[PDB]
Amino acid sequence: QKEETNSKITKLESSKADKSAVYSKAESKIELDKKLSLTGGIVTGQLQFKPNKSGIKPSSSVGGAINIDMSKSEGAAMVMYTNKDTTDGPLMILRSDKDTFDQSAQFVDYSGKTNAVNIVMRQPSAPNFSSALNITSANEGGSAMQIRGVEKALGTLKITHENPNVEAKYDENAAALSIDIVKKQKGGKGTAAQGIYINSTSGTAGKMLRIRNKNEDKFYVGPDGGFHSGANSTVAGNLTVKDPTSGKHAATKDYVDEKIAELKKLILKKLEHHHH
Amino acid sequence: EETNSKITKLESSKADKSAVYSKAESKIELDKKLSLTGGIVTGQLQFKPNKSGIKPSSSVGGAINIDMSKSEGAAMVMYTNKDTTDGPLMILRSDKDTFDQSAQFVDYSGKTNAVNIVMRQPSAPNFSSALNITSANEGGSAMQIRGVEKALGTLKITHENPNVEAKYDENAAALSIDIVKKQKGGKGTAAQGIYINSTSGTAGKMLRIRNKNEDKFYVGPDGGFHSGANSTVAGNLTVKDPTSGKHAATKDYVDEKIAELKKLILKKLEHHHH
Amino acid sequence: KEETNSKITKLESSKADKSAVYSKAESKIELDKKLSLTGGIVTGQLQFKPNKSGIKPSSSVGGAINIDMSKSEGAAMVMYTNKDTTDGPLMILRSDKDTFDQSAQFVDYSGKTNAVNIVMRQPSAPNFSSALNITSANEGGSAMQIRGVEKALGTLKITHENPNVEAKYDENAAALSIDIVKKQKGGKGTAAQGIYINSTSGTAGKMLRIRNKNEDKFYVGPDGGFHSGANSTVAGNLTVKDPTSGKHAATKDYVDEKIAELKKLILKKLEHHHH
Ligand SMILES: CC(=O)N[C@@H]1[C@@H](O[C@@H]2O[C@H](C(=O)O)[C@@H](O[C@@H]3O[C@H](CO)[C@@H](O)[C@H](O[C@@H]4O[C@H](C(=O)O)[C@@H](O[C@@H]5O[C@H](CO)[C@@H](O)[C@H](O[C@@H]6OC(C(=O)O)=C[C@H](O)[C@H]6O)[C@H]5NC(C)=O)[C@H](O)[C@H]4O)[C@H]3NC(C)=O)[C@H](O)[C@H]2O)[C@H](O)[C@@H](CO)O[C@H]1O
Numbered sequence A: 001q002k003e004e005t006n007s008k009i010t011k012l013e014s015s016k017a018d019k020s021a022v023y024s025k026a027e028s029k030i031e032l033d034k035k036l037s038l039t040g041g042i043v044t045g046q047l048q049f050k051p052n053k054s055g056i057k058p059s060s061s062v063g064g065a066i067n068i069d070m071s072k073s074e075g076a077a078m079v080m081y082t083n084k085d086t087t088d089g090p091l092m093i094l095r096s097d098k099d100t101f102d103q104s105a106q107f108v109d110y111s112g113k114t115n116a117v118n119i120v121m122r123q124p125s126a127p128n129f130s131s132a133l134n135i136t137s138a139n140e141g142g143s144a145m146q147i148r149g150v151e152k153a154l155g156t157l158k159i160t161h162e163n164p165n166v167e168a169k170y171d172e173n174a175a176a177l178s179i180d181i182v183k184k185q186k187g188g189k190g191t192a193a194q195g196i197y198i199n200s201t202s203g204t205a206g207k208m209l210r211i212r213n214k215n216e217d218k219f220y221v222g223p224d225g226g227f228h229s230g231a232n233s234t235v236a237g238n239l240t241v242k243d244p245t246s247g248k249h250a251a252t253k254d255y256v257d258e259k260i261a262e263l264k265k266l267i268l269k270k271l272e273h274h275h276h
Numbered sequence B: 001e002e003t004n005s006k007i008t009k010l011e012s013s014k015a016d017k018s019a020v021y022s023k024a025e026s027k028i029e030l031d032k033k034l035s036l037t038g039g040i041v042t043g044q045l046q047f048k049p050n051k052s053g054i055k056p057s058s059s060v061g062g063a064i065n066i067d068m069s070k071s072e073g074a075a076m077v078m079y080t081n082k083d084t085t086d087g088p089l090m091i092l093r094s095d096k097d098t099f100d101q102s103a104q105f106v107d108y109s110g111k112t113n114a115v116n117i118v119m120r121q122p123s124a125p126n127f128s129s130a131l132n133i134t135s136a137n138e139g140g141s142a143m144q145i146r147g148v149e150k151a152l153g154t155l156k157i158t159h160e161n162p163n164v165e166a167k168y169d170e171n172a173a174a175l176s177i178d179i180v181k182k183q184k185g186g187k188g189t190a191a192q193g194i195y196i197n198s199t200s201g202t203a204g205k206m207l208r209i210r211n212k213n214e215d216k217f218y219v220g221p222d223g224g225f226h227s228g229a230n231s232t233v234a235g236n237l238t239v240k241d242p243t244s245g246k247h248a249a250t251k252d253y254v255d256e257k258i259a260e261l262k263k264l265i266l267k268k269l270e271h272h273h274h
Numbered sequence C: 001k002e003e004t005n006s007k008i009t010k011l012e013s014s015k016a017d018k019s020a021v022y023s024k025a026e027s028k029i030e031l032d033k034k035l036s037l038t039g040g041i042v043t044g045q046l047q048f049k050p051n052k053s054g055i056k057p058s059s060s061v062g063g064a065i066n067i068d069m070s071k072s073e074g075a076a077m078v079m080y081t082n083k084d085t086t087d088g089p090l091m092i093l094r095s096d097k098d099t100f101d102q103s104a105q106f107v108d109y110s111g112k113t114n115a116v117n118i119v120m121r122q123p124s125a126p127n128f129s130s131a132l133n134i135t136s137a138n139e140g141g142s143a144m145q146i147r148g149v150e151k152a153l154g155t156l157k158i159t160h161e162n163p164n165v166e167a168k169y170d171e172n173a174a175a176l177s178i179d180i181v182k183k184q185k186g187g188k189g190t191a192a193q194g195i196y197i198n199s200t201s202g203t204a205g206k207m208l209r210i211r212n213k214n215e216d217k218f219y220v221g222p223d224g225g226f227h228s229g230a231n232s233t234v235a236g237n238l239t240v241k242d243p244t245s246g247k248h249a250a251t252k253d254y255v256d257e258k259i260a261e262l263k264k265l266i267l268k269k270l271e272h273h274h275h
């Protein structure tokens, strides 16, 4: 015992941490479990990104406010899933508001051996008016959509219509491609727009329009504009042509009339001076 | 004496080492958690909102919201250099056929292409596309496009020869259409290739075909056509009786002119005297 | 008294020093720098680098990020900008290996509106830009494919709408515009076709049907026969079959043979008439 164990007690009261002024390990676990671990976890509220002088890059490998690199991992980078019956908005939205914006909303830069982007609308229980992909532009200065391919032996755009039913005449009103040409919806007075415009700006040796059925040629328009039709055909009007110079060329009115006039002349000549 | 009270107050009121983290242990535990200023996540981050005030708003909504208004750079980049893998990079999925919104909505103002998909040149050509579209919904068009072009096509397709040699692409086309029966047990099809219409009515050509920018064939708004070269029908062609020199003559026209000449000649024959 | 120096040494041993632990307030400061699972604002780059981390391809539960909206209103993800200009696209998907055997994006959609919907809004000034641009340099495959099963519609539906009230303003426009070009770098030409229509199975339908105000104007039928609904022209000869009906076009052979028959009959009547 002394008078100075009271010094040692005061050193402990001074130098050791009070319970009320620090978190216990259990309180710490509680508070840490409310935070996202780098190894994964479940976010139940809104996660907002608001980068601001944050070194975010445009790079298509290392950029982005979010960047997901799957180079060393199996699996998808990102999945958005819903089994909801109905809801108040789309799964994914990309939006840009300034008409000076000089980049795309979405850029896909794809190397690989399957389809870069693949959009599937599954069979509904009841048919309805909806599409896999809808495109709309209100920009008059540009094509709403552009496609450019380098196919050796295929179409740049390939469209297949497939009968949804087993019965051969169920799809008789359907088409692979349907084109409409309309006046302005709000107060338009008409339109002069064309349906299909085909050109070859460099010049092609190929057929401009080729039609087949069961793989057999039925109708074509050649590079010179001449056509070949494979069956009986009709013009509800006159057909202007060149005068024929071969047996199966269509005859003109001039050709008929000239032939008639030649025969006439020869016969009238024989009539005016036959003797018995 | 009464210092055993003071000792018991310290044993009661002071924190035990075993029951609290050191500063060093705290750093370790904090470094495992994501800083608001950024970090690297190495596991799955799952979003499971549930009565969480998530909105549909195309500016402030989303379980994730990225606003790039005040920042340079991309909002999001998904990248892979992997040789092969077990699934697509991004997937959107909706399971109920009553679902009444889109999987993806792009709302774009700007002066370049809103969405831009590029398939790069492979080492070896293969059957794969930039964009593949499939619908099993018979009540709707698989794809729809609407544009308001002053002087362009709503859809522009260009085919470009992949090779220097002029004939290499002789089996290619800009647009290729096929019309097929149902794959599982179908008995045939009556579907059409191309259906063009103007529901309001157009003064324009329905089909206009050029080569090197010079008109070669067209179909006009009335259905009449102009062909720019020798042509063939493997069959009969029905026309109207000609009323001008270069109109094609009908069988009736030929026969009536033959009959008129006949009549005139037989009349002169039956009635001349010597 | 005397031996409580053991009890003091047990306190010096067992109790935490102030200097070696964070106060509650220091802890709050450090925790407030970290993201709460209930939400918050990230201001730097969030990087995902999974590496033997059990990430799956599943279109319901996979992904380094997975968003399930089954139990919640709202969008899964929103990317927005009101910026004037910037240095790159909002969203980017990129794959580098030409052996890569999956898609960049897969949309598996059931529902009753459009799966993917791309809208280019009206700009202040017309310009050359599109809602959707597609480009392939793969010669072995079609740049784009579409398959549909429509009962009574087109698989691809294209509408051109006049941007202006005046009827002739859009006279150079088209619903579909096709070009056929040689290779840009040193190409010697092309033999590619414009439009190729086929039915591999065989169709009873018209191959090409053109209407104006819903009335048939021109068509090509399943057999290749055409019907044109107005005055028409060939700048050249037209080969046809010899006519066997009144309105069939007459051939040169038909004209010549009928001329020769009449000739024969007349010369015969001439060499044998008597008065
Ligand atoms: C159908 C038809 O006939 N239409 C006619 C028009 O023709 C069309 O023109 C368009 C057009 O050019 O506007 C053509 O589309 C282009 O097609 C190209 C493929 O051949 C696409 O690459 C191009 O898209 C651009 O590609 C850039 C690229 O090279 O990758 C992208 O830029 C990169 O962006 C990323 C992300 O921001 C950056 O990371 C990257 O950078 C580099 O990053 C890195 C790194 O490691 O991350 C390293 C480097 O050091 C960095 O520099 C960018 N790269 C560069 C080079 O800057 C662009 O974002 C992307 O847009 C397509 N162009 C567009 C605008 O879409 C189409 O093929 C034609 O058909 C014709 O123009 C018109 C008038 O004549 O008439 C029409 O009828």
Ligand SMILES: CC(=O)N[C@@H]1[C@@H](O[C@@H]2O[C@H](C(=O)O)[C@@H](O[C@@H]3O[C@H](CO)[C@@H](O)[C@H](O[C@@H]4O[C@H](C(=O)O)[C@@H](O[C@@H]5O[C@H](CO)[C@@H](O)[C@H](O[C@@H]6OC(C(=O)O)=C[C@H](O)[C@H]6O)[C@H]5NC(C)=O)[C@H](O)[C@H]4O)[C@H]3NC(C)=O)[C@H](O)[C@H]2O)[C@H](O)[C@@H](CO)O[C@H]1O
Pocket: A088, A089, A090, A093, A134, A135, A136, A180, B056, B057, B058, B059, B060, B105, B144, B145, B146, C113, C114, C117, C119, C157, C158, C159
């Ligand atoms: C090719 C052809 O001829 N087809 C024929 C059919 O024509 C096609 O019709 C479709 C159609 O109408 O179904 C046309 O597609 C529409 O095109 C419009 C452009 O002209 C698009 O805007 C429209 O897309 C819809 O756009 C909505 C919009 O109002 O902009 C979106 O709604 C917004 O969604 C966001 C995100 O969920 C919400 O935030 C927002 O809300 C507001 O939010 C905010 C905010 O700051 O966030 C502020 C406001 O206070 C809130 O109210 C929504 N907006 C509002 C106000 O509701 C939709 O999500 C999006 O769908 C296109 N519509 C569709 C369904 O795709 C196409 O142009 C035509 O070609 C024709 O229908 C048919 C005739 O029988 O025949 C076909 O052959």
Ligand SMILES: CC(=O)N[C@@H]1[C@@H](O[C@@H]2O[C@H](C(=O)O)[C@@H](O[C@@H]3O[C@H](CO)[C@@H](O)[C@H](O[C@@H]4O[C@H](C(=O)O)[C@@H](O[C@@H]5O[C@H](CO)[C@@H](O)[C@H](O)[C@H]5NC(C)=O)[C@H](O)[C@H]4O)[C@H]3NC(C)=O)[C@H](O)[C@H]2O)[C@H](O)[C@@H](CO)O[C@H]1O
Pocket: A114, A115, A118, A120, A158, A159, A160, B086, B087, B088, B091, B132, B133, B134, B178, C057, C058, C059, C060, C106, C108, C145, C146, C147
């Ligand atoms: C237009 C035309 O005539 N073109 C023809 C070609 O025709 C086309 O063939 C395509 C083809 O490649 O087969 C057809 O596309 C396929 O369409 C179906 C819908 O009918 C679509 O489902 C295919 O996408 C694939 O879908 C599967 C799926 O089963 O859902 C996806 O796999 C799944 O992935 C998720 C996520 O990773 C997993 O969770 C899930 O477990 C997994 N499921 C399974 C079973 O593994 C897969 O990712 C996806 O590819 C789609 N196929 C492709 C490759 O896109 C197209 O409809 C059709 O028109 C024709 O093939 C050729 C023949 O020479 O000629 C062309 O002219």
Ligand SMILES: CC(=O)N[C@@H]1[C@@H](O[C@@H]2O[C@H](C(=O)O)[C@@H](O[C@@H]3O[C@H](CO)[C@@H](O)[C@H](O[C@@H]4OC(C(=O)O)=C[C@H](O)[C@H]4O)[C@H]3NC(C)=O)[C@H](O)[C@H]2O)[C@H](O)[C@@H](CO)O[C@H]1O
Pocket: A194, A197, B151, B152, B153, B156, C171, C172, C173, C174, C177, C179
């Ligand atoms: C109304 C009419 O019949 N006009 C007659 C006129 O025919 C028209 O010719 C013009 C033309 O060649 O100038 C055609 O305009 C072309 O239309 C296509 C499709 O809409 C469009 O792609 C062309 O734009 C050019 O093409 C592209 C491209 O990306 O496709 C790039 C060029 O830079 C771009 O400008 C467009 N051409 C122009 C210059 O606008 C129109 O379709 C025809 O109807 C005919 O030539 C003359 C002489 O007989 O008479 C008129 O009455």
Ligand SMILES: CC(=O)N[C@@H]1[C@@H](O[C@@H]2O[C@H](C(=O)O)[C@@H](O[C@@H]3O[C@H](CO)[C@@H](O)[C@H](O[C@@H]4OC(C(=O)O)=C[C@H](O)[C@H]4O)[C@H]3NC(C)=O)[C@H](O)[C@H]2O)[C@H](O)[C@@H](CO)O[C@H]1O
Pocket: A172, A173, A174, A175, A178, A180, B192, B195, B199, C152, C153, C154
């Ligand atoms: C088999 C055959 O030759 N039928 C003859 C028939 O021609 C058919 O006419 C119908 C019709 O106009 O009623 C055509 O059907 C139309 O086909 C297109 C292309 O698939 C489709 O877009 C039409 O859908 C309508 O489209 C629109 C719209 O504005 O886009 C509005 C409507 O809601 C939508 O349904 C579709 N029309 C309908 C109602 O089915 C068909 O393609 C032609 O083959 C001809 O009219 C009659 C009389 O001479 O004879 C038949 O033999």
Ligand code: NI
Pocket: A274, A276, B272, B274, C273, C275
């Ligand atoms: Ni006589």
